[PDB]
Amino acid sequence: GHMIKICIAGKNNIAVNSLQFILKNYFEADQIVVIPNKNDKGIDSWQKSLLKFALDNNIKIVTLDEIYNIEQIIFFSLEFDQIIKIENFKSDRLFNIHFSALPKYKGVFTSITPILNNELESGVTLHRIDNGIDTGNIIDQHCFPIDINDTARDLYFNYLKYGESIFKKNIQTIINNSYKDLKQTNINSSYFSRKDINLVHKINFKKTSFEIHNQIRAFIFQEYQLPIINNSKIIKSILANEFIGYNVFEEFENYFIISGIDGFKIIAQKLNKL
Template sequence: MTVRPLNSVFIGGRQIGANCLRVLVDMDAPPQLVIPDPDDVGVDSWFESLVKVAKELSLPTLRGARVKDESAIKKIRALKPDIIFCIGSMQLIPKEVLAIPPLGVVNIHPALLPKYRGRYSTAHAIFNGEKETGATLHFMDERIDSGPIIMQEAFPIGNEDTARVVYDKFTEVGTALFKRFVESLKRGEEIASTPQDESKATYYPKGLPSGGKMDPSWDEVTKKRFVLAMTFPPFPMPDID
């Protein structure tokens, strides 16, 4: 079996970012550079700090930088990565960076795209009464969560699942998807992808379901969905009186 060297840059955050960074190292494909989110100061919160994990793995790290900064763009361009992984990061990737790697920039989104593009996808899926959601590994483009789909896997949303439970399921499934993808890259396989069906796309901007406020006129089923959608320890619940 042919094993292809993998030159990459890793932009990341959240637990799925830490998990996937470890996957690369475990598979003998460490990135040339790790770029954590600028607010990562090296201390764990509800997820592991990518700064801390990169240090433990002895990986070159660009701390406190925004990907859109000219200095960061120059550094990435100088490395000539084949591919860029953007996993769990809160940063928007500028077109100048999207154009650098010949194999593209890859992201993992916590939903079954093209549905639930945007933020708080798990919370919106629960509030809307979805019975399943999933993880989608896709190419990034200049729009939000709209690039071609490479891999996708669904998992059920249980009747009592909170947003935190569903997000943790996504982290596990998304990490497994990432490992499969890296395995295929190392075998030198061509990356197959499918354009998203825009007629089925839904987009949720930055806000929480119902603006994070319960409507007292809702029926009991809707109220329960709202509570489950808003339950994400360690963050406090909003006022639901």
């Protein structure tokens, strides 16, 4: 049966680089379809455009409706924006790479939520798609550090890097259908929705230096927003082990020096610094 073997649905460098990899190594253009996200305008910007790549390489753009009845298609979500209902699909080869160490941080804004909840590590997880949000059985996972001064943007670029890597690592077993999976546990499972995160974050300074630093850097992702302290945008936060006294807060031309209830030095750099 069908001409079409695989759909890449989603966006950004992970979708494009994964598509490029399958086109290189596994499938021809006329065996592939893509479903870009709704906001993809076909322009390479701070991320590559999946729509652009498809148009440039002669790969058909489709809707979900067009692929539901396609027997045995591999459906791969790589930052895809639409919740699927699995019973729509004839095929049960439905996979996602989620940007967290599941079962933690299901849902959205995963470059923000682990930092804001004081994690020292995150991960990428390849899993089956079921009808819930990031709830399906885990196939592989790679965990990696959130370095102490990483911003949400830095973490997102690590997700793209390690996510592309885990795709390449696992795709052969998906294609031959010999992969193994395990149910997610109930314990440690967590979830955040768009509503749970106010993107204009008001910092609670009656917190430890680690928590104040995490509140700042979790919102540093300049293409979307920067945290504002005393009507200044912040581009970087640096947390030191140096004790400087409790509850320090001082504004300078290029930065703030801050400490919380445990007195460790934070330098919050203003965007205006040359």
